[PDB]
Amino acid sequence: SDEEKVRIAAKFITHAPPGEFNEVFNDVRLLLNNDNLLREGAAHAFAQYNMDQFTPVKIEGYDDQVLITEHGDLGNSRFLDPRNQISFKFDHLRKEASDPQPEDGGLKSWRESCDSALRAYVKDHYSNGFCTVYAKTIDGQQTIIACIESHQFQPKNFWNGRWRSEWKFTITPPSAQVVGVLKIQVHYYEDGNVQLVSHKDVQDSVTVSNEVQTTKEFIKIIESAENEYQTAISENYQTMSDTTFKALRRQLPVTRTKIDWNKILSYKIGKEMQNA
Amino acid sequence: MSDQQLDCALDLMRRLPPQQIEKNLSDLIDLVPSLCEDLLSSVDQPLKIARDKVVGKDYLLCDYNRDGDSYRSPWSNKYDPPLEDGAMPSARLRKLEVEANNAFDQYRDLYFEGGVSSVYLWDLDHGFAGVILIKKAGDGSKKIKGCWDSIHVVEVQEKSSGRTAHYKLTSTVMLWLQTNKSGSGTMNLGGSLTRQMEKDETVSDCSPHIANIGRLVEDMENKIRSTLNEIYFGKTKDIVNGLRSVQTFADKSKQEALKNDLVEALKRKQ
Amino acid sequence: WXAXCPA
Amino acid sequence: DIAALVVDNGSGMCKAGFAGDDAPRAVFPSIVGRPRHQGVMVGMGQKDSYVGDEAQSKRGILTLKYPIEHGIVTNWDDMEKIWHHTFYNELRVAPEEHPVLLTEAPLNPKANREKMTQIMFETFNTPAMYVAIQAVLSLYASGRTTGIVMDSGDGVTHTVPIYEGYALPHAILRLDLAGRDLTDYLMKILTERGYSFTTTAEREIVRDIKEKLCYVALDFEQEMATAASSSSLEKSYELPDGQVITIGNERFRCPEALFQPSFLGMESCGIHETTFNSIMKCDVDIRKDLYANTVLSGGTTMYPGIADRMQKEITALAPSTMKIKIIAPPERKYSVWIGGSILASLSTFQQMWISKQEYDESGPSIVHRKCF
Amino acid sequence: LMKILTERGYSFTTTAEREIVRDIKEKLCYVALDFEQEMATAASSSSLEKSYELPDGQVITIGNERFRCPEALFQPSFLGMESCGIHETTFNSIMKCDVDIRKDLYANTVLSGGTTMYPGIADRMQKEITALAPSTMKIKIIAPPERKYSVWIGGSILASLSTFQQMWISKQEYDESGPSIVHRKCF
Ligand SMILES: Nc1ncnc2c1ncn2[C@@H]1O[C@H](COP(=O)(O)OP(=O)(O)O)[C@@H](O)[C@H]1O
Ligand SMILES: Nc1ncnc2c1ncn2[C@@H]1O[C@H](COP(=O)(O)OP(=O)(O)O)[C@@H](O)[C@H]1O
Ligand SMILES: [Mg+2]
């Protein structure tokens, strides 16, 4: 059925490697061979993808880009920038912002206390990343959501990469839970395809003060946590060749010398004595 | 448009997760029906272990030992399901096919420490061309979870002088890894690769056709696994590093000043 | 031996 | 006034001199010798440790220890003897009034450089010092601001791609295979014909036999067939006791271990694949610049025929549109030192010495944020 | 032993007498567990001396010289040699092996051949190798009570295998490539 064929299209599209949505989309369109079906069905899948990517976009005439997220989804293909307190229509196919409208409670103080400290963490540690503080109330609890994205794409060096991150804090006086999720994807396509995909949960708790100093607790945790996660990854790639990647296949035999294909019967005889 | 459909479908299989290629490729076939026989015969697939009940050694399934909807087991030379008119190699080749199945079982044992392997052979007008299949999966513990899939295609141009032959190998390697720790989270690495090479080695009683390809395969797999470890240890490492510094890196005036002085001095000196 | 050591 | 001192002090040999000359003043084997037997004759002078060239001269009664192993200092109380000998017996100048430039192989533990600067400041009282990367200077010695330097000292190997002077720290490939491993493997393969060199002194005999006769062949299998079919690759050597040994196949089997480390029991890649990975690990817009300006260096690259062999291997690895060109200077052995004498003699480098005042106000760790 | 026995006043220099020296060695000498403590034991009170009778009927008496001969295994400096003892030799040979397999190596360290049949060599080897290897590792010096012929026993076991019935270099094979064929077949 064209519903299932379109369902298979959403499968393929929503797994597109970061920065390669357009290249997947053209082939999926041409293989489906129906722009009308794809324009009526896949408009959900494109939105699913642009949220999963925390897609950054430049609002025209404004000083910083904004991150497309479910935490900013207003329906109608509108999204919120909580920094300027304005919403825009977003083109989920073209990645264009349009129609900036005013989109003005007690979370404001927190929204600010956090955002400048978060932009300081971005300025300190990210080369070309972005961030946003969304804020919401859940069952009367004040909930602050801090989002980070970084993405380098180089279709002339043949590699694409992304480092997304999301954090939650909920005011539970004199304390809070801290929930973090760190997500990475990367792909290299020079004469072969190699892909890293990796997600980590982080969780901790904090003791409250005024909003300002409480924010510096939040950032000091996030800094320590991302520093440890990236450290763990660097040590892991410096250790896999002799442990994990060594598990699947051995770089060289226990002999530490290539096989001597003349002698090949001799390699039986140890295992003969395990039956003897 | 048909090749434009075909070249676009092959661009999909470079831009998907490699853990589910045998799922995505079936899905791509599921979406379009006109490309069934092509992509099963053109792009690679992870293998499929079937069971031998006569002798009791596992083996692998591909298109070269396939006749109709059955598959030739190399350890018994009988198709399962039982066919009474299949495709058999010559009595010259059955001597070699067990010999190459002895050697690449031994290359399976020293390098992988487990897994399954298979060799098949078929004939050409002036030589023989074969296939070497190898699969090894995770042993059961969680840091090992993932599979390796090696597929080779050799061909041999036996020159009628009887001294030297022309060897040609087109290898591909499918890989997927998943490691889990408390500090590193959950890394689901993986990928794929293909290469080819040639050789003109002499053939004699001191270096037969079994020992000739036996140096050809384990050299190419070493040249493939070494540089595949230098894509992980290569780009996918410092791409992740090149996305922030743990350190506030300062300005560089005098370092750059020394660079400039060196440049100016070497404009005369060189 | 021939060089170094007797044998 | 005062002229800066340059001291390589890499594995195997210490090369030191004054900055401004075109050759190191003193080159001596960086070893330390302890007497293996107890003296019986008095009134003729007895030392508990011969250092430098004296040790190699009297190696027949000494146990010889190299203070550096694989580029990492293993016994500092002998490295201090090495430096004291360098300063007072070869250069003949007190270090307390001469700034010094030292070299370090890349990717060496931070504790090594830290202890190095701490010793150089607190024991020898030098007014100021600096630590440069051992491979970067060798690209200055050739005048190339950009290019890939393959340095292969006697004990360590490293390939460093450097563009516009700023070396790329993400493509610096280390390799533990070097001259000392080639000496060990040469001993092990000499055992095949019946020659057993096993003592610490005889390692210098086999080391000299390698530095003199060994050579890298273009095609290994063809040369193996040649050395098997006839006796035209036989060469004779004369030990320092008069015996005459003869080596055939072993002449090129030993150095070829650089290109196939499997021969030596090493899982790593050869030096040609290492250089190709160092060129492939960087951008695709400068990969070509690196291919045309490949600079060799270090003593282990002084083998006859390594240039053509490296060129063949790299052009077989690299694409067919890139032009390969191996730049092999005629004085590679001292290339790292020469490049130093340039860097120290620059009129813009004298604002980069770690001054003793700066040291005491910031501790040793300042070396980790002053030297790149 | 032919050298250290002179300090007592004995002279064996003839090849016929080297056999008597070998017989005294494999009858009285024994490795000590703490060489310095046994030296102090011998210097404190003579209770280690044993009487041996040559084929002439003289009654020689070796005391301290019992363990000074086998100790030369662990300290080749006594023989004017530079290399290290047998324990450090085994330690370096093991640490040259692949890291993953080392865990099983330290458990199956086996002594063999004649010279390892010294009284007390097992405990000494174990102490030395466990003081050299880390404490997490399990050191087992397995010493078969018939290790004088273990090489031949293993050769017989290997030769009796049907799988080994194809590994014999045959005469007709020898005629093809000359004696050099031995370098190819044998590992
Ligand atoms: N042609 C050669 N063949 C073999 N070994 C050589 C050759 N040339 C130099 N070497 C080795 O390299 C050493 C010189 O290296 P050098 O340039 O001083 O760097 P390092 O100070 O790290 O040893 C020699 O002493 C020798 O062991
Ligand atoms: N208990 C022992 N103490 C000292 N030496 C011994 C002992 N047992 C055997 N040996 C010595 O070991 C050697 C015998 O070892 P063996 O296994 O026969 O090897 P080989 O065949 O090379 O002699 C002889 O020198 C013998 O005197
Ligand atoms: Mg050097």
Helix H, strand E, coil C: the string for D139-151 is HHHCCCCCEEEEE
Q: Give Cα separations from D295 to D138, D150, D291 (angstroms).
A: 8, 6, 10
Cα E37 to ligand 2 centre (Å): 27
Residue D363, Cβ neighbours under 10 Å: how many? 11
Q: Tell me how the structure was determined.
A: cryo-EM
Q: List the domains of chain D with CATH numbers.
A: 3-134+336-372 (3.30.420.40), 135-176+270-335 (3.30.420.40), 177-268 (3.90.640.10)
What six digits make up the tokens of E167? Answer: 């590994």
What six digits make up the tokens of A223? Answer: 């800094």
Chain E hits for B206, Cβ within 8 Å = 177, 184
Contact with chain E for residue A272, Cβ under 8 A: yes
Nearest CA to ligand 1 atom 24: D299
Cα D334 to ligand 1 centre (Å): 10
Starting from the CA of residue E23, give the closest ligand: 2
CATH of the domain at B9: 1.20.58.570
Smallest CA–CA distance from D286 into chain A, residue: A157
Ranges of beta strands (E only) in A82-158 are 86-91, 96-102, 130-138, 141-154
User: Of B72, B89, B106, which one is at a domain's C-terminal end?
Assistant: B89
Give the length of chain C: 7
One DSSP character per residue, A221-271 reads: HHHHHHHHHHHHHHHHHTTGGGTHHHHHS-SS-TTSS---TTSGGGGGHHH
Cα E154 to ligand 2 centre (Å): 17
Do B69 and B95 reside in the same domain of the chain?
no
Do B157 and B241 reside in the same domain of the chain?
yes
Mark yes or no for CB contact E184/B205 under 8 Å.
Answer: no
Q: Name the residue among D20, D294, D280 with its Cα closest to residue D135.
A: D294
Do B119 and B235 reside in the same domain of the chain?
yes
Determine the Cα–Cα distance for residues D180 and D186; give it in Å rounded to an integer: 10
Determine the Cα–Cα distance for residues B169 and B157; give it in Å rounded to an integer: 12
What six digits make up the tokens of E52? Answer: 């041996």
Single-letter amino acid code for the residue at E32? A
Single-letter amino acid code for the residue at D337? W
Residue E157, Cβ neighbours under 10 Å: how many? 12
| Minimum distance, in Å, between the CA of residue B187 and any CA atom of chain E | 23
| Minimum distance, in Å, between the CA of residue A152 and any CA atom of chain D | 14
User: What does this entry list as its resolution, in Å?
Assistant: 3.3
Determine the Cα–Cα distance for residues B189 and E161; give it in Å rounded to an integer: 46
D65 beta partners? D32
Do B94 and B190 reside in the same domain of the chain?
yes
What six digits make up the tokens of E130? Answer: 């466990």
Q: Which DSSP letter does residue A17 get?
A: P
One DSSP character per residue, D87-113 reads: IIIIS-S-GGGS-EEEEE-TT--HHHH
Q: What is the largest CA-CA distance in chain E?
A: 69
| Bond from prior residue into D319 cis (ω within 30 degrees of 0) | no
Determine the Cα–Cα distance for residues A18 and E120; give it in Å rounded to an integer: 69
Do B189 and B270 reside in the same domain of the chain?
yes
Q: Around B45, how many Cα atoms within 13 Å sit in the side-chain half-sphere?
A: 17
Do B137 and B266 reside in the same domain of the chain?
yes
Contacts of E6 (CB under 8 A, 6+ apart): none
Single-letter amino acid code for the residue at A240? M
Q: Which domain holds residue B133?
A: 90-270
Do B115 and B222 reside in the same domain of the chain?
yes
| Minimum distance, in Å, between the CA of residue D234 and any CA atom of chain C | 18
CATH of the domain at B97: 3.90.1150.210
What six digits make up the tokens of D363? Answer: 């501790």
Q: How many domains does chain B have?
A: 2
Mark yes or no for CB contact B262/D346 under 8 Å.
Answer: yes
Q: What is the largest CA-CA distance in chain B?
A: 84
Do B58 and B108 reside in the same domain of the chain?
no
Residue ranges of the domains in chain A?
Answer: 1-104, 105-248
What six digits make up the tokens of D205? Answer: 């005999």
Smallest CA–CA distance from D197 into chain C, residue: C4
Do B197 and B129 reside in the same domain of the chain?
yes
Q: Which DSSP letter does residue D284 get?
A: S
Do B85 and B108 reside in the same domain of the chain?
no
> Could you give the dihedral angle defined by the CA atoms of residues A235, A237, A241 and A244, in that order, rounded to the nearest 10 degrees?
80
Which of E115, E118, E125, E146 is the pocket-test mutation for ligand 2 (most atoms within 8 Å of CB)? E115
Q: Name the residue among D120, D153, D128 with its Cα closest to residue D2.
A: D128
Smallest CA–CA distance from E184 into chain B, residue: B206
Give the length of chain B: 270
Task: Count interface pairs C-D at CB distance under 8 A.
Answer: 18
Do B59 and B139 reside in the same domain of the chain?
no
Contact D309, D259 (CB under 8 A): yes
Q: Around E161, how many Cα atoms within 13 Å sit in the side-chain half-sphere?
A: 21
